[PDB]
Scaffold this motif. Structure first.
Motif, mmCIF file in Angstrom:
data_model
loop_
_atom_site.group_PDB
_atom_site.id
_atom_site.type_symbol
_atom_site.label_atom_id
_atom_site.label_comp_id
_atom_site.label_asym_id
_atom_site.label_seq_id
_atom_site.Cartn_x
_atom_site.Cartn_y
_atom_site.Cartn_z
ATOM 1 N N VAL A 1 11.126 -0.155 1.247
ATOM 2 C CA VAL A 1 9.976 -0.062 1.665
ATOM 3 C C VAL A 1 8.835 -0.973 1.182
ATOM 4 C CG1 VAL A 1 10.662 2.400 2.004
ATOM 5 C CG2 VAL A 1 9.114 1.839 0.445
ATOM 6 N N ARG A 2 7.772 -0.911 1.750
ATOM 7 C CA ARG A 2 6.513 -2.027 1.370
ATOM 8 C C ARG A 2 5.364 -1.068 0.732
ATOM 9 N NH1 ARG A 2 3.546 -6.335 2.752
ATOM 10 N NH2 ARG A 2 4.693 -7.028 4.410
ATOM 11 N N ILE A 3 5.558 -0.831 -0.589
ATOM 12 C CA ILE A 3 4.921 0.012 -1.559
ATOM 13 C C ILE A 3 3.550 -0.856 -1.687
ATOM 14 C CG2 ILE A 3 4.362 1.161 -3.620
ATOM 15 C CD1 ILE A 3 5.739 2.494 -1.484
ATOM 16 N N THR A 4 2.240 -0.296 -1.437
ATOM 17 C CA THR A 4 0.881 -0.749 -1.913
ATOM 18 C C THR A 4 0.526 0.124 -3.007
ATOM 19 O OG1 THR A 4 -1.326 -0.818 -1.316
ATOM 20 C CG2 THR A 4 0.090 0.068 0.386
ATOM 21 N N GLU A 5 0.422 -0.259 -4.229
ATOM 22 C CA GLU A 5 0.105 0.390 -5.312
ATOM 23 C C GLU A 5 -1.291 -0.252 -6.038
ATOM 24 O OE1 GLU A 5 3.083 -0.221 -8.519
ATOM 25 O OE2 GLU A 5 4.158 -1.585 -7.536
ATOM 26 N N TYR A 6 -1.864 0.652 -6.765
ATOM 27 C CA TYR A 6 -3.018 0.205 -7.330
ATOM 28 C C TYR A 6 -2.975 0.230 -8.855
ATOM 29 C CZ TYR A 6 -5.408 0.636 -2.898
ATOM 30 O OH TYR A 6 -5.883 0.524 -1.449
ATOM 31 N N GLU A 7 -4.136 -0.265 -9.668
ATOM 32 C CA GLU A 7 -4.175 -0.681 -10.830
ATOM 33 C C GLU A 7 -5.542 -0.727 -11.166
ATOM 34 O OE1 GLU A 7 -1.910 -3.948 -12.257
ATOM 35 O OE2 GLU A 7 -1.915 -2.901 -14.556
ATOM 36 N N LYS A 8 -6.127 0.084 -12.458
ATOM 37 C CA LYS A 8 -7.215 -0.063 -13.061
ATOM 38 C C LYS A 8 -7.213 -1.424 -13.767
ATOM 39 C CE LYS A 8 -9.297 4.691 -13.325
ATOM 40 N NZ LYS A 8 -10.434 4.006 -12.403
ATOM 41 N N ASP A 9 -8.375 -2.043 -13.570
ATOM 42 C CA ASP A 9 -8.768 -3.424 -14.359
ATOM 43 C C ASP A 9 -9.093 -3.249 -15.695
ATOM 44 O OD1 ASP A 9 -8.545 -6.244 -14.491
ATOM 45 O OD2 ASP A 9 -9.327 -6.438 -12.547
ATOM 46 N N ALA A 10 -9.599 -4.233 -16.196
ATOM 47 C CA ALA A 10 -10.029 -4.225 -17.792
ATOM 48 C C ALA A 10 -11.457 -3.434 -17.619
ATOM 49 C CB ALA A 10 -10.400 -5.660 -18.204
ATOM 50 N N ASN A 11 -12.129 -3.566 -16.407
ATOM 51 C CA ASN A 11 -13.252 -2.626 -16.016
ATOM 52 C C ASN A 11 -12.618 -1.325 -15.537
ATOM 53 O OD1 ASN A 11 -13.053 -5.176 -14.602
ATOM 54 N ND2 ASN A 11 -13.993 -4.114 -13.038
ATOM 55 N N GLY A 12 -13.454 -0.484 -14.924
ATOM 56 C CA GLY A 12 -13.315 0.657 -14.079
ATOM 57 C C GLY A 12 -12.744 0.441 -12.725
ATOM 58 N N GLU A 13 -12.663 -0.609 -12.288
ATOM 59 C CA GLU A 13 -12.283 -0.768 -10.862
ATOM 60 C C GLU A 13 -10.952 -0.972 -10.469
ATOM 61 O OE1 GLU A 13 -15.554 -0.025 -11.387
ATOM 62 O OE2 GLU A 13 -15.490 -0.356 -9.153
ATOM 63 N N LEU A 14 -10.384 -0.652 -9.416
ATOM 64 C CA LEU A 14 -9.113 -0.558 -9.070
ATOM 65 C C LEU A 14 -8.697 -1.811 -8.257
ATOM 66 C CD1 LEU A 14 -8.898 3.140 -8.071
ATOM 67 C CD2 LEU A 14 -7.120 2.042 -9.507
ATOM 68 N N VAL A 15 -7.723 -2.689 -8.711
ATOM 69 C CA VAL A 15 -7.191 -3.706 -8.177
ATOM 70 C C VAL A 15 -5.923 -3.424 -7.325
ATOM 71 C CG1 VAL A 15 -5.721 -4.818 -10.151
ATOM 72 C CG2 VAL A 15 -6.740 -6.325 -8.252
ATOM 73 N N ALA A 16 -5.668 -3.868 -6.080
ATOM 74 C CA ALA A 16 -4.598 -3.479 -5.188
ATOM 75 C C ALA A 16 -3.573 -4.467 -5.366
ATOM 76 C CB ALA A 16 -5.093 -3.256 -3.928
ATOM 77 N N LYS A 17 -2.498 -4.006 -5.194
ATOM 78 C CA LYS A 17 -1.148 -5.163 -5.043
ATOM 79 C C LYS A 17 -0.058 -4.623 -4.158
ATOM 80 C CE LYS A 17 1.437 -5.924 -8.555
ATOM 81 N NZ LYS A 17 2.592 -5.602 -7.801
ATOM 82 N N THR A 18 0.614 -5.466 -3.466
ATOM 83 C CA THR A 18 1.459 -5.124 -2.447
ATOM 84 C C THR A 18 2.976 -5.825 -2.626
ATOM 85 O OG1 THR A 18 -0.324 -5.171 -0.990
ATOM 86 C CG2 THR A 18 1.797 -4.397 -0.001
ATOM 87 N N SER A 19 4.026 -5.255 -2.404
ATOM 88 C CA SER A 19 5.293 -5.925 -2.610
ATOM 89 C C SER A 19 6.604 -5.072 -1.854
ATOM 90 C CB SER A 19 5.687 -5.749 -4.049
ATOM 91 O OG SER A 19 7.101 -5.855 -4.240
ATOM 92 N N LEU A 20 7.567 -5.656 -1.740
ATOM 93 C CA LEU A 20 8.603 -4.839 -1.070
ATOM 94 C C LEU A 20 9.465 -4.375 -2.273
ATOM 95 C CD1 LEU A 20 10.871 -6.665 1.572
ATOM 96 C CD2 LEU A 20 10.234 -4.178 1.201
ATOM 97 N N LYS A 21 9.402 -2.997 -2.294
ATOM 98 C CA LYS A 21 10.271 -2.460 -3.664
ATOM 99 C C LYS A 21 11.419 -2.037 -2.943
ATOM 100 C CE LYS A 21 7.563 -2.401 -6.793
ATOM 101 N NZ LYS A 21 6.253 -1.796 -6.748
ATOM 102 N N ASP A 22 12.609 -1.661 -3.905
ATOM 103 C CA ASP A 22 14.011 -1.315 -3.530
ATOM 104 C C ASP A 22 13.900 0.074 -4.083
ATOM 105 O OD1 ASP A 22 16.669 -0.646 -3.118
ATOM 106 O OD2 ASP A 22 16.757 -3.050 -3.114
ATOM 107 N N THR A 23 14.045 1.245 -3.314
ATOM 108 C CA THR A 23 13.926 2.745 -3.505
ATOM 109 C C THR A 23 14.833 3.354 -2.672
ATOM 110 O OG1 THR A 23 12.180 4.333 -3.686
ATOM 111 C CG2 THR A 23 11.714 2.392 -2.325
ATOM 112 N N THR A 24 14.365 4.742 -2.733
ATOM 113 C CA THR A 24 14.893 5.595 -1.674
ATOM 114 C C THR A 24 13.650 6.089 -0.437
ATOM 115 O OG1 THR A 24 14.684 7.511 -2.796
ATOM 116 C CG2 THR A 24 16.706 6.317 -3.164
ATOM 117 N N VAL A 25 14.352 6.982 0.444
ATOM 118 C CA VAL A 25 13.300 7.529 1.362
ATOM 119 C C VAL A 25 12.235 8.545 0.533
ATOM 120 C CG1 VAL A 25 13.083 8.575 3.652
ATOM 121 C CG2 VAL A 25 14.621 6.725 3.183
ATOM 122 N N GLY A 26 13.128 9.476 -0.289
ATOM 123 C CA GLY A 26 12.269 10.530 -0.907
ATOM 124 C C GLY A 26 11.264 10.216 -1.790
ATOM 125 N N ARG A 27 11.476 8.920 -2.405
ATOM 126 C CA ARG A 27 10.587 8.470 -3.317
ATOM 127 C C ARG A 27 9.314 7.868 -2.722
ATOM 128 N NH1 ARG A 27 14.947 5.270 -7.307
ATOM 129 N NH2 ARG A 27 16.445 7.114 -7.614
#
Ligand SMILES: [Mg+2]
Ligand SMILES: [Zn+2]
Ligand SMILES: [Zn+2]
Lengths: 1327, 347, 75, 49
Positions: free
Chosen positions: A536-562
């Motif tokens: 599935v394609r998971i768009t996950e986020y991450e807090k930067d050096a400041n308090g703002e969230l940067v987004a990133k997207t990739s094709l992860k290898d996982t299961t349906v339940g996760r």
DNA sequence: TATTGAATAAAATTGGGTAAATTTGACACTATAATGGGTTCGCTCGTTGTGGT
DNA sequence: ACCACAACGAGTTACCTCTCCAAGTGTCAAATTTACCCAATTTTATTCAATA
RNA sequence: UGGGAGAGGUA
């Protein structure tokens, strides 16, 4: 209403008459013809007040028109009947009688006041022996107690020159005739001449008593009662029973006995009775007054007609069912309900299900207020009948009242502070309370019949305290450790484990999905399984050096339940916390990580969503338990038959007589334990990996989907020991005397046990079920002792301004790291900077709160020793500072000033009681001719310094153990260089040469016998007891010389190289042999919760460990006794200090080498008083913290160290005076350390010398009883002793503690009351 | 009168009888207390006497006791246990003679059973003769070991010999851990009798023994035919061989209907025989509160499922269907007495 | 501010002083006969005071200078 | 909610009047304890500063 | 034209006392001989206070 | 000085449920109240006049 | 009115 302190003193006879309202003369309580109390009786309305509100007794002035008149027909003042429980009386005793507290509360204080034995004083009071009071002749000095024979012949000798009396009148005359200040100056004179500590302590006790009497200002003759006060008759009521008869009170019976005997003594005294009869009547009145004051103290308790002893006034003050603990520290409380609790799986974390009938009873005056505000009810009676008939508008007004009005839910026993929490109530039908499932761990609640109490906070401040402090969404983290108390438990855990757990060829494998919404679509439509390995394609986020969230997207290898769990994981967390099979530890780590990244509100929403999806997917899993799920390994019969063959082989070996019973039975235990662990390993393997039959790559192994294994492996409910009992072998059981049986239970619960195996298992079953009850009682008593020792500790400063600290270190005891430095120091405040060249030269500032960022800084810069400000070294008086405490473990930031950290620490310690390269340091080594490093010092230990600057391994090498490697080289993995002789220790030399057996004669100090085991004629030493007359002077000193004969000289000193070898030591080498520098010549052969209670109680061990009091060279002072004498003299000063050591204890450090300050000279467990007074406060705190945390880590519980430091700081409040300065602290007395520190502060401020002290480690009970608040000590324990000492000293409680302000009924100086209390302090200090 | 009424009214061993079900009555009557006048004292006793002694086998049950502070102090008699003439407990045993396990039943006290060697109850036989193996498992001097078939002196008379009555009513007791078996044996006495009693599908065989020996049913005194059945009276015409020659040969069995028990439950007897049926001596004619056809019946048979259901069975909780409530399966009658006494005040 | 009080706590600095200031404001809103500065949205005066602290209109010195100002108006 | 006889009636009427404010006083059980320690022959008393 | 400082009878109130009513606790009521008592131990652990060599 | 005995106290929290716990009647000295007498004081009205 | 004992039970 307005009052600062509470003073206690003795009661003068004029004061006892001053509180009184009329003398009680007759012993009749009430007439039984008509219910009217008799005049001058125990219930007399002319004395105590009218029985009706504004009505005289005979019925003459029944209205409020006469607000008070004395009705001349019956003498009764027409007032309210509230004065019946407030007006006292008194009885004028004919003969004076001794007070039983000031006589038989040991130490007696009348015998201590007069320096008389209590046996002699009771002999005087029992009219058996006379005591003289004054004498004009020199033959009869004062207090010379005479018998009747000596009294009669002294009467015929002198007659009127002396005057001896008997009874309590004699003791009152002695106390009246003694001179307080004259005895004070005489005792202060006599203090200097004595030298024994026992006599000196007796003199200091007597001078403290006399100075306390003078400084209080009481008189010593008020310890003998001449007037006795009467309790008001509504505080001892005459309750009527259902038969028409009465159950009269014990105080009424005891007052009846006292009044009857006093009246008969008055009649016998004015009747001129004989002396024997009047002495018996005086003795009986003394016994009756002593029974009334304290029944069971002097003789046999006066028992009632029901064969039960009568409750006295002391029995009404003291005990668990006494006034303090039963009605003052804890009360019964209005606006409160109680019901059985059920589950609330639809609720939120702030909600609870409250029944409608329960809430309608609890919230009734709020309902009346809303009814009279809306105008639906004309009056209170109309509103009351409207609620009594329960209109629909009454239920609507209840729905309006309930909203945003929190209630407190509480479950007993409230062991820690999360046993009461606040919830917003939800009105439900039914009769059970609905509890949220995630708070049941913090409540220790299950749903097998638990009940909880509801409490409604009334005031606006109480509602705001419930909303801002005690709400369940406000305490996510524990106060003990920083870990979250909201962990999902077993069903959420089973559901998320089944959700995240993968499978190899489930359904719809290998697809490529657009996202988690398409994964949810596939699962709900039925085209894919929960465990399908998918991309599935998971768009996950991450807090930067400041308090703002940067987004990133990739094709992860996982299961349906996760992917479906990612829909409820909030924005800010990575996919790595979802991309594995989530167990209980993984879900708790995910919640803690969400906390540390996002805060409180996303953590609460995330815990709710975790609970909902875990419940839903555990339900959709359909997990069950069948009899075919507990799979037994098929090799159980083979392993069992092999073990039976082994026991049969060793049985015929015992029948051959080759093996004896003890090691035979030990080998049988080892055989059955080997078979037990082998069948357990086979069971775990077969249960863990039998699911192999698969496809799409091949038939391949994977993790088994057995439901028993899933419940075990997820950490939901179960463990490998219980799975072993279910499917493998039950194991080896034990006899009730602690001994393991020879044969184990070879069956399991799937196959069932026979009758013998079941009867064998019942011993351990009933033993554990008795131990649970006993440990609940012991842990409750320990928690109460801890709360009372730490009740008055509150953070009253922000920064005390000190440089003291505690050297923190990672505990590396044994063979591994026990606690890392990160969690050992996390949240503390550094005493100074860290100073090293190191790898980065990190300079943390002074007084920094160590967050996780600074913990990572110290980890990446490889620090091993940090000095942080502790609680026991805080400079604040009457409380601690916030910097010395550190981080508030429940809220994550620094501690606010005004928080009851002593109560928090005591509850945190008493809650889990129900669960209860080579580096060398401190070396004095010698190198022989072969380089074989055998150690000859005693406190030598080794370390393993790493390649970065951290120690990773600790081993204390014993004296005489052998080591091959030196220092400086890199260690090797697996190379266990540490080997030893585990049965003997040597006496190894250090100077080479030819040995000459000097300073010894054959026959009196050494036994001449050729050894039968070696054959060589070797010289043996003998013990100092059986020696001749020539053995009473010299000791056998093996003066080792070099090859030519004369003694060598050790560089650095001038003493000859001679060493006194101890008795019963076999010496093998003879004269004319060569010695090396480090070879031997003689080889002498060698609970958890009660442990925590003993560590906190400062109980000395059954076998102590003698330590070296002074540094220097050790010698001997006296011989020819098993209880020998040791002298230890320094190289600079003199030492007349001699000890007393028995011979049945061994001796560690010999009498030739110079010892250090406070090292062990006799092995065994150390005593903490010795550790304190010989090493320091830091050493005794490190010892107590390590020895309590060892128990708490052996049972697998995580408690912070600052809580134990808080308890030790409360244990170290007292400081004995060793030398006076200019202050009025004389000698050898115990006073509070804050008083000494304040006196030394002001003396060095104004320019005086100041006093010196020595701190004392009191126990927890002794410190709680020796606190300077007599109200707190009396409400803790021993109310008779504490109130007697406080009444004698004339103490006053300034009401500075939480227990004192709870008893009095005020705001505590903690929390929201702290600002009000410091405002009151500045108001009473400014004006 | 003062002495005997003081004893029988307010001794420490004169106890308010538990009569929730027949099992509670029979267990309260078969109770042994270590406390009492001249016995132990509760707060002043430790683990030395609260343990299971190896002499308790067949005399005192190891898995029926309370789990509070009275745990080793209040005990239950075993099923076959008796007393001596002196008052010491004894249990029956089968005597073997040259391997032949006879029907010779000997009641041995705890001092006699340590001298002999007693075989276990779970050791097989053939034709009621020898043992089919040659090394049977036995117990001597309190410890257990293997012994030969000619060495053996005795054998246990049954397999329910160790446990009490309430621990013998638990089916598959040997698969239950002893903690939960103790808790279940205790909780069997707290069961309220329901509207319609229901025999258990999985029982033991002690059900009829408890339901007759508890005295809560109405057993027949003499065998005969039944002449009249009301809901409150059963009349039985006795057979002629069991009839005394001087009497009329008619037995009347009046039944108790809706009597409040000690725990404010219901006690009523319902006739289980029909009109004209024959009965024998010892036949149950009327059921008890929680009996059914002369079998003990403390609860109901519920179709159960073992699965988590949305958190509604979270921590020991139970999710219940609606057929349980509509079918009145756990509907209990609770008779309750309230007294109003007009006293004599002085006004 | 109904569920949690974390924004008001990071506004004030101490939960005890938060309780005292919000209790003063809820007393003025309940029996003092005042009107809120936030829309009440059918809430109790406790939660209205906590929402006012969360928004940032009510503080200890704000309540003190407001009481002193209305004291100078009434005198 | 307990032994303050002149305070709990005030609290009840305050709740009916819509005023969620208490006026606490001394516990009557503390007055009972003071009377019992005074009856034991020991002069304990509250101190008006 | 008026309100009030000083002064003074003067009756009410405080304090003390005092002789006469009136309670109050006790006692009468009575004589073959009798002459010295019934009441808790199977609790532990620890602590502190007392007495001999 | 050190050891060996007596006595106190303590032992979780609630919660429940029950039961059980002879007859006034006349007489005496003292002391106790009680209605009351009376100086010291002082509270309240009442006269003189004298500033305003 | 509502107290004190004794017994039993629940978590
Ligand atoms: Mg439970
Ligand atoms: Zn009257
Ligand atoms: Zn500090």
């Amino acid at each position: 209403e307005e009052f600062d302190a509470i003073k206690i003193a003795l009661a003068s006879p004029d004061m006892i008459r001053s509180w009184s309202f009329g003398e009680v003369k007759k012993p009749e309580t009430i007439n039984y013809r008509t219910f009217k109390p008799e005049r001058d009786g125990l219930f007399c309305a002319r004395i105590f007040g009218p029985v009706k509100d504004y009505e005289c007794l005979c019925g003459k002035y029944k209205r409020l028109k006469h607000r008070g008149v004395i009705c001349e027909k019956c003498g009764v003042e027409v007032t309210q009947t509230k004065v019946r429980r407030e007006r006292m009386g008194h009885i004028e005793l004919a003969s004076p009688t001794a007070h039983i507290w000031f006589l038989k509360s040991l130490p007696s204080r009348i015998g201590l006041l007069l320096d008389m034995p209590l046996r002699d004083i009771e002999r005087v009071l029992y009219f058996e022996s006379y005591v003289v009071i004054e004498g004009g002749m020199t033959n009869l000095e004062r207090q010379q107690i005479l018998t009747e024979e000596q009294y009669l012949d002294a009467l015929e000798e002198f007659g009127d020159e002396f005057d001896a009396k008997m009874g309590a009148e004699a003791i009152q005359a002695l106390l009246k005739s003694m001179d307080l200040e004259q005895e004070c100056e005489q005792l202060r004179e006599e203090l200097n001449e004595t030298n024994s500590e026992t006599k000196r302590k007796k003199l200091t006790k007597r001078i403290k008593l006399l100075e306390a009497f003078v400084q209080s200002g009481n008189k010593p003759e008020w310890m003998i009662l001449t007037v006795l006060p009467v309790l008001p008759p509504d505080l001892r009521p005459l309750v009527p029973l259902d038969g028409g008869r009465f159950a009269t009170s014990d105080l009424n019976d005891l007052y009846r006995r006292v009044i009857n005997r006093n009246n008969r003594l008055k009649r016998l005294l004015d009747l001129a009775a004989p002396d024997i009869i009047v002495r018996n009547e005086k003795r009986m009145l003394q016994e009756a007054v002593d029974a009334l004051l304290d029944n069971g103290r002097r003789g046999r308790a006066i028992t009632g007609s029901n064969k039960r002893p009568l409750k006295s006034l002391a029995d009404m003050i003291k005990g668990k069912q006494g006034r303090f603990r039963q009605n003052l520290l804890g009360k019964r409380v209005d606006y409160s309900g109680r019901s059985v609790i059920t589950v609330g799986p639809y609720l939120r974390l702030h909600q609870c299900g409250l029944p409608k009938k329960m809430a309608l009873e609890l919230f009734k005056p709020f309902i009346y207020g809303k009814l009279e505000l809306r105008g639906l009810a004309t009056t209170i009676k109309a509103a009351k009948k409207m609620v009594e008939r329960e209109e629909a508008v009454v239920w609507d007004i209840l729905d309006e009242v309930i909203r945003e009005h929190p209630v407190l839910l509480n479950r007993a026993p409230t062991l820690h502070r999360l046993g009461i929490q606040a919830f917003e109530p939800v009105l439900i039908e039914g009769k059970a309370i609905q509890l949220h499932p995630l708070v049941c761990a913090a409540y220790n609640a299950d749903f097998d019949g638990d009940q909880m109490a509801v409490h409604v906070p009334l005031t606006l401040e109480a509602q705001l305290e419930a909303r801002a402090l005690m709400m369940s969404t406000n305490n996510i983290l524990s106060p003990a450790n920083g870990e979250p108390i909201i962990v999902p438990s077993q069903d959420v855990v089973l559901g998320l484990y089944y959700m995240t757990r993968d499978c190899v060829n489930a359904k719809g494998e290998g697809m490529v999905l657009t996202g988690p919404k398409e994964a949810e679509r596939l699962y709900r439509s039925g085209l894919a399984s929960l465990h399908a390995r998918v991309k599935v394609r998971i768009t996950e986020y991450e807090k930067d050096a400041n308090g703002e969230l940067v987004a990133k997207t990739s094709l992860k290898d996982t299961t349906v339940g996760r992917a479906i769990l990612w829909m409820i994981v909030p924005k800010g967390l990575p996919y790595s916390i979802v991309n594995q099979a989530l167990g209980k530890k993984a879900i708790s780590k995910m919640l803690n990580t969400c906390y540390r990244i996002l805060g409180l509100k996303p953590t609460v929403i995330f815990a709710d969503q975790i609970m909902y999806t875990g419940f839903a997917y555990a339900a959709r899993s359909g997990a069950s338990v069948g009899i075919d799920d507990m799979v037994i390994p098929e090799k159980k019969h083979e392993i069992i038959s092999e073990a039976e063959a082994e026991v049969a082989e060793i049985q015929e070996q015992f029948q051959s007589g080759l093996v004896t019973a003890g090691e035979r039975y030990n080998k049988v235990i080892d055989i059955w334990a080997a078979a037990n662990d082998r069948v357990s390993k086979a069971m775990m393997d077969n249960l863990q990996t039998e699911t192999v039959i698969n496809r799409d790559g091949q038939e391949e192994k994977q993790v088994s989907f057995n439901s028993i294994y899933m419940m075990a492996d997820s950490g939901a409910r179960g463990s490998a020991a219980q799975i072993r009992q279910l499917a493998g072998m039950r194991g080896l059981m034990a006899k009730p005397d602690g001994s393991i049986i020879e044969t184990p239970i070879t069956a399991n619960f799937r196959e069932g046990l026979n009758v013998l195996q079941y009867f064998i298992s019942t011993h351990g079953a009933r033993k554990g079920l008795a131990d649970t009850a006993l440990k609940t009682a012991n842990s409750g008593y320990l928690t109460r002792r801890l709360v009372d020792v730490a009740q008055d500790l509150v953070v009253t400063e922000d920064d005390c301004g000190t440089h003291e600290g505690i050297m923190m270190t990672p505990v590396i005891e044994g063979g591994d790291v026990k606690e890392p430095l990160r969690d050992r120091v996390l949240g503390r405040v550094t005493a100074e900077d860290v100073l090293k060249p190191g790898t980065a030269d990190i300079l943390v500032p002074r007084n920094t709160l160590l967050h996780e960022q600074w913990c990572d800084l110290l980890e990446e810069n490889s620090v091993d020793a940090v000095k942080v400000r502790s609680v026991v070294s805080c400079d604040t008086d009457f409380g601690v500072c916030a910097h010395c405490y550190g981080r508030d473990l429940a809220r994550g930031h620094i501690i606010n000033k005004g928080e009851a950290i002593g109560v928090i620490a005591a509850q945190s310690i008493g809650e889990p009681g129900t669960q209860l390269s080579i580096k060398l340091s401190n070396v004095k080594s010698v190198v022989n001719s072969s380089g074989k490093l055998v150690i000859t010092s005693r406190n030598t230990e080794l370390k393993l310094i790493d390649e970065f600057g951290r120690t990773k391994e600790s081993y204390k090498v014993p004296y005489g153990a052998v080591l091959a490697k030196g220092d400086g080289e890199q260690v090797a993995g697996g190379e266990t260089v540490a080997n030893w002789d585990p049965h003997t220790m040597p006496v190894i030399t250090e100077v080479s040469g030819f040995v000459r057996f000097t300073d010894m004669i054959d026959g009196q100090t050494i036994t001449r016998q050729t050894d039968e085991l070696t054959g060589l004629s070797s010289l043996v030493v003998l013990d100092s007891a059986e020696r001749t007359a020539g053995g009473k002077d010299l000791r056998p000193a093996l003066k080792i010389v070099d090859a030519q004969g004369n003694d060598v000289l050790i560089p650095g000193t001038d003493m000859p190289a001679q060493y006194f070898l101890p008795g019963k030591a076999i010496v093998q080498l003879e004269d004319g042999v060569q010695i090396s520098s480090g070879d031997t010549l003689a080889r002498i052969p060698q609970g958890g919760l009660p442990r925590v209670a003993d560590l906190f109680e400062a109980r000395r061990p059954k076998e102590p460990a003698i330590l070296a009091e002074i540094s220097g060279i050790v010698s001997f002072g006296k011989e020819t006794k098993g209880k020998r004498r040791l002298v230890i003299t320094p190289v600079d000063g003199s030492d007349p200090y001699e000890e007393m050591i028995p011979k049945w204890r061994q001796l560690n450090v010999f009498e030739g080498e110079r010892v250090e300050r406070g090292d062990v000279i006799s092995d065994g467990p150390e005593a903490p008083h010795d550790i304190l007074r010989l090493r320091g406060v830091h050493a005794v705190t490190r010892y107590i913290v390590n020895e309590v945390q060892d128990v708490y880590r052996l049972q697998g519980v995580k408690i912070n160290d600052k809580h134990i430091e808080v308890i030790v700081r409360q244990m170290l409040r007292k400081a004995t005076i060793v030398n006076a300065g200019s202050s009025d602290f004389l000698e050898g007395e115990q006073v509070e350390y804050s008083r000494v520190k304040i006196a030394n502060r002001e003396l060095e401020a104004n320019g005086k010398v100041g006093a010196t002290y020595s701190r004392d480690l009191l126990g927890i009970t002794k410190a709680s009883l020796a606190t300077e608040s007599f109200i707190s000590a009396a409400s803790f324990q021993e109310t008779t002793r504490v109130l007697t000492e406080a009444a004698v000293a004339g103490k006053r409680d300034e009401l500075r503690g939480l227990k004192e302000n709870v008893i009095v009924g005020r705001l505590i100086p903690a929390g929201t009351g702290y600002a009000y209390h410091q405002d009151r302090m500045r108001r009473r200090a400014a004006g | 009168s003062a002495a005997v009424k003081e004893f029988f009214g307010s001794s420490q061993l004169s106890q308010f009888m538990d009569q929730n079900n027949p099992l509670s009555e029979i267990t309260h009557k078969r109770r042994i207390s270590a406390l009492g006048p001249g016995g132990l004292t509760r707060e002043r006793a430790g683990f030395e006497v609260r343990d299971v002694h190896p002499t308790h086998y067949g005399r005192v049950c190891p898995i029926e006791t309370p789990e509070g502070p009275n745990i080793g102090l209040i005990n239950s008699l075993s099923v076959y246990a008796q007393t001596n003439e002196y008052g010491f407990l004894e249990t029956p045993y089968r005597k073997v003679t040259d391997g032949v396990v006879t029907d010779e039943i000997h009641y041995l006290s705890a001092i006699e059973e340590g001298n002999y060697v007693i075989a276990q109850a779970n050791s097989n036989l053939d034709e009621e003769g020898h043992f089919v193996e040659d090394l049977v498992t036995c117990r001597s001097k309190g410890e257990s070991s293997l012994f030969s078939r000619d060495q053996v002196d005795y054998m246990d008379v049954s397999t329910q010999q160790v446990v009490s009555v309430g621990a013998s009513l638990i089916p598959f007791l040997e698969h239950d851990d002893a903690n939960r078996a103790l808790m279940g044996a205790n909780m069997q006495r707290q069961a309220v009798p329901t509207l319609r009693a229901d025999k258990p599908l999985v029982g033991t065989g002690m059900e009829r023994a408890v339901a007759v020996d508890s005295g809560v049913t109405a057993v027949a005194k003499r065998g005969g035919v039944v002449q009249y059945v009301d809901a409150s009276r059963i009349v039985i015409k006795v057979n002629e061989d069991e009839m005394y020659p001087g009497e009329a040969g008619i037995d009347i069995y009046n039944l108790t209907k809706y009597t409040r028990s000690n725990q404010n439950t219901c006690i009523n007897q319902m006739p289980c025989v029909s009109l004209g049926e024959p009965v024998e001596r010892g036949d149950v004619l009327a059921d008890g509160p929680s009996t059914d056809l002369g079998e003990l019946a403390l609860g109901q048979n519920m179709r159960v499922a073992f699965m988590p259901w949305n958190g509604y069975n979270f921590e020991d909780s139970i999710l219940v269907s609606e057929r349980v409530v509509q079918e009145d399966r756990f509907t209990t009658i609770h008779i309750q007495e309230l007294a109003c006494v007009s006293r004599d005040t002085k006004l | 501010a109904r569920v949690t009080v974390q924004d008001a706590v990071e506004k004030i600095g101490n939960r005890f002083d938060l309780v005292l200031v919000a209790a003063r404001r809820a007393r003025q809103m309940q029996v003092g006969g005042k009107d809120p500065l936030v829309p009440e949205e059918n809430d109790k005066t406790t939660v209205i005071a906590l929402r006012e602290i969360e928004e940032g209109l009510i503080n200890n010195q704000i309540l003190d200078v407001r009481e002193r100002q209305e004291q100078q108006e009434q005198e | 909610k307990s032994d303050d006889v002149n305070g709990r009636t005030k609290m009840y009427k305050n709740i009916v009047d819509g005023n969620h404010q208490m006026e606490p006083g001394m516990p009557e059980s503390f007055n009972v304890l003071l009377k019992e320690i005074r009856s034991l022959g020991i002069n304990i008393e509250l101190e008006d500063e």
